[PDB]
From a paper:
Twisted gastrulation (TWSG1) is an evolutionarily conserved secreted glycoprotein which controls signaling by Bone Morphogenetic Proteins (BMPs). TWSG1 binds BMPs and their antagonist Chordin to control BMP signaling during embryonic development, kidney regeneration and cancer. TWSG1 is composed of two distinct, disulfide-rich domains. The TWSG1 N-terminal domain occupies the BMP type 1 receptor binding site on BMPs, whereas the C-terminal domain binds to a Chordin family member.
To understand how TWSG1 interacts with BMP ligands, we determined the crystal structure of the TWSG1 NTD in complex with GDF5 at 1.96 Å resolution. The disulfide-linked GDF5 dimer binds to two TWSG1 NTD molecules that are related by a non-crystallographic pseudo two-fold axis (RMSD of 0.419 Å for 138 equivalent Cα atoms of the 1:1 TWSG1 NTD:GDF5 complexes). The two TWSG1 NTD molecules in the complex adopt a similar conformation compared to the apo TWSG1 NTD (0.33 Å for 38 equivalent Cα atoms), with the major variability observed in the loop connecting helices α1 and α2. The TWSG1 NTD binds to the finger region of GDF5 and interacts with both protomers of the GDF5 dimer. The TWSG1–GDF5 interface centers around helix α1 of TWSG1 sequestered between the two finger-like motifs and helix α3 of GDF5. The side chain of TWSG1 Ile40, at the core of this interface, inserts into the hydrophobic pocket of GDF5 formed by Trp414, Trp417, Val448, Ile449, Phe478, and Tyr490, and is shielded by a salt bridge between TWSG1 Glu42 and GDF5 Lys488. TWSG1–GDF5 interactions are mediated by two salt bridges (TWSG1 Lys28-GDF5 Glu434 and TWSG1 Glu42-GDF5 Lys488), 4 hydrogen bonds, and 72 hydrophobic contacts involving 20 residues from TWSG1 and 18 residues from GDF5. Unexpectedly, the structure of the TWSG1–GDF5 complex reveals a previously unknown calcium-binding site at the edge of TWSG1–GDF5 interface. In our TWSG1–GDF5 complex, the TWSG1 NTD occupies the BMPR1-binding site on GDF5. We identified the TWSG1 NTD as the high-affinity BMP-binding domain, enabling us to determine its structure in complex with a dimeric BMP ligand. This structure revealed that TWSG1 NTD binds to the same site on BMP as BMPR1, suggesting that TWSG1 inhibits BMP signaling by competing with BMPR1 binding.
Author numbering:
A (entry chain A): 397 to 501
B (entry chain B): 398 to 501
C (entry chain C): 25 to 49, 53 to 77
D (entry chain D): 25 to 48, 53 to 78
Write the structure that this text describes.
Amino acid sequence: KARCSRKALHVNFKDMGWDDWIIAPLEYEAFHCEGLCEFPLRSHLEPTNHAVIQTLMNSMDPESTPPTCCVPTRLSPISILFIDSANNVVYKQYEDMVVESCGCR
Amino acid sequence: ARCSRKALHVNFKDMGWDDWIIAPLEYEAFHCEGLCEFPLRSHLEPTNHAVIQTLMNSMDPESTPPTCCVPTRLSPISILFIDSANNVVYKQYEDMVVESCGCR
Amino acid sequence: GCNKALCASDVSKCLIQELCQCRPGCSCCKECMLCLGALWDECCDCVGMC
Amino acid sequence: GCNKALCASDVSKCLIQELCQCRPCSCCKECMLCLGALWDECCDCVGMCN
Ligand SMILES: [Ca+2]
Ligand SMILES: [Ca+2]
Ligand SMILES: [Ca+2]
Ligand SMILES: [Ca+2]
C-alpha cells in the first residue's frame, strides 16, 4: 500500500453516458489521488498545519484519531466542445478537470 | 453519515508539545469524516474532478475509488511558544481549525 | 426519491455545467430542470429541487 | 531511517513552525537547529540528512 500518490484515471465520456452532449474530446486522463497518509507527511509538499497536527495525533493513537486523506491539491483544466441545455454549441475551458498534485489533507 | 465536520480536541501535552508551547494548552481543531458518494452536495463545493470521480465510482466502485472528505476551509489560532533559539513568540498559526469539510 | 442508478449520469452532467447549485433559500431552480429534461421527475430529489 | 515513535512529535513541531519544508538547500540549517539532539535520529523524516 503506497503513500499518497497521483495515479492513473482514464475518463471515457461514452462510458459515463455523456456522448449525447459532449462532442470532443471523448476521453481524457484525469488522474486520481490515493494512498497512505501517515507520519511523516511529505514535508516539501507543504501540508496544512491542521493536517500535520492530525497526522501527529493519528501517530500517537490511530485508534483514537483517524488519518488525513490523500486528495488533489492542484488541478488543471481541459477544454470541451459540447451542446448545452439550450442546444447551443459551446467550446469551454472546464476548470479542475485534471489532478496535478496529491497531498494529505 | 455523509462528509461532515466532527469534533477533535487537541491537547498539547498529550502529544508531547508541552515542553515548547506555553499557551493555550489545548484547542478544538475539528476534523472531516464521512461518506463521499453520489450525489455530492453542492454545499461540499466539489471540484469538477470530484464530480466526475464520484460518478465513475458510483457506476463501478470496483474500478474507481470514491473521493475523500477533507477540510476545505480552515481558520487560524494564536500560540505563545518557545522557538528553537529560546525566544518567546506569540504568533498566529494559519490553517489550524476546520471550518468546512467537502469531498475532493 | 433519488434513483442513483437512473440519475447519476445526467445529474452529474448538470453539476459540472454549474447548474443545480443555487440553493432554494431561488435562481437556477429552472435552468436545472431544463438540463435534466424528462428526468426532472425521477431525479429532482437528487438535488432536492422539489 | 525515521523512528516514528521517537520523531513524530518533534518533527511535527518543526513542520508547523514552517521549518523543514525545503529540499536539497536554504532552510537546511534552521531545521537542524529545531530538531536539536534528534537531528541524527530524525533528519530522514524530512529528507535533510545530506
Ligand atoms: Ca446520456
Ligand atoms: Ca516534547
Ligand atoms: Ca420521464
Ligand atoms: Ca543524538
